[PDB]
Amino acid sequence: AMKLALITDTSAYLPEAIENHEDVYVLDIPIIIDGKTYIEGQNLTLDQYYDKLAASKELPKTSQPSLAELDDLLCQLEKEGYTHVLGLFIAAGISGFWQNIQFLIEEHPNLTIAFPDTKITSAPQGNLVRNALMCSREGMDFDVIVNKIQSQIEKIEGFIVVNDLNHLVKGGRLSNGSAIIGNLLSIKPVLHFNEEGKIVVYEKVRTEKKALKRLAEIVKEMTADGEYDIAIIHSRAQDKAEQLYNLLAKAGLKDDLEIVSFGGVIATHLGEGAVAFGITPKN
Template identity: 30%
Template sequence: MQDYIIITDATSDLPVDIIKSLDIIVLPMEFIIENQVYSHYPDGREMSFCDFYSHLKMGRMSSTTQINYNTYKSAFTDILNEGKDILYISFSSGLSGTYNAARLVINDLKEEFPDNKILAVDSLCASIGEGLLVYLAALKRQEGFSIDKLKQWIENKRFEVCHWFAVDDLEHLKRGGRINAAQASVGTILNLKPILSVNREGKLVNVTKMRGKRKSFNYLLQKLKEDGENIESQTIMVGHANCEEDAVYLQQLILEQELASKVIICNISPIIGTHTGAGMIALTFVGRR
């Protein structure tokens, strides 16, 4: 077993059982509702996923903050004091300042721990796209990849992670400035579901709109068929923002059509859900981004 630790952010939206089984450390991230600050952990210990989305449905606003210097330093120092090296896989720099914040801490810690390796990789991924990349990296670590070899592998593989998001709540896209008020109003009336993706710069982009959930799910499946590579041997991830029935439905479609043999369902965290709202369905796989 390689003597280094993989660390990532709470934005990776990985299930707790995967995190534990692959010895991944997930740094909590904060969100704020009605002036109350909560730290989101993968097990939802301070606020459950269901309770969070209930707040949003009641019209309460949520905001998020990036991981601060002291949180990084404390988490990294604990591991370095154990004599282990660190490979940190961050949330996309195209969507957050977390990667650059971590780099500042790492530069300072290199002076204090000159004999340790402290490496950081910008995932250029979001939500379960980031989660899939971390999951695959952790499997490579189990195979015996050195920390340097794995860093190079991630930097290449991140461009092969395909992200597709079908958004249900247009109000949150309006608040985030991705659509205007008129588009949100018309889209809601016509039951339009925006389809978003992540580009090679790690930024969220609007791709198209589908009318109704079924058509949006079919679009996601079509992208899996068109862009996925060797998908029958892949692990596919489906994420949901408090709409598990939809996630199970999409999972069943993938399995019934024998597009993949393993589909993992993940909860979309409050950190991501703050910006997408409830009802979002996400699909991620390895292929041509």
């Protein structure tokens, strides 16, 4: 008789149906401005965020969610009667949170716990949570769910075109960024997540027009092997997303296509004006 909890962080973009689910727990990710404002939804709205972004002369940072909060949540779940836990957090390659939480599995021996590296964030992450839920709701064993999710983690893809690369380079989530930045400044590169879940340059594309067109072509390639939920995601780049939406509408892919926003967590590392897509296998 499994009672399974789902833990994630606020970088995951959660489907509408899964939002307020009673087995879903969401850890907060702090943003650090001048030390000024800190947690979206408590202490900082998205509009205040962008206002604070424009006005600072230093870049914002983020920090890992609290190890102590996870620790205390795990203990709370154990006494709330949960038997298994699946933790689906932000990519290991863009935050050491995944590596940092691993010891916690040994510290709570009264639960069966899996923290697989999602290698993604935003909407694919949220889709994983949702997927694991329907799997649970389908009577599937913990190892099998974990299994299905790991193989799903393998088909997920995340491609990005940013407006300005400083956020990615100086924030440090673009790999080898300070060595390659001089080459990318005059152009509009297409970026993606690695096999290790790192952000690397997929392709040098010279113009923004061709960049977006190239994104639509990439979606068509990536989704050729099955049925995918597709998300266009932007940080105040409405027009770039509607454009890509139309490119994908034309290509025949309108049906599982949704436009969603980034929060301050990812805006911090991507900058404003960013556009991306993420795909996730259908459950």
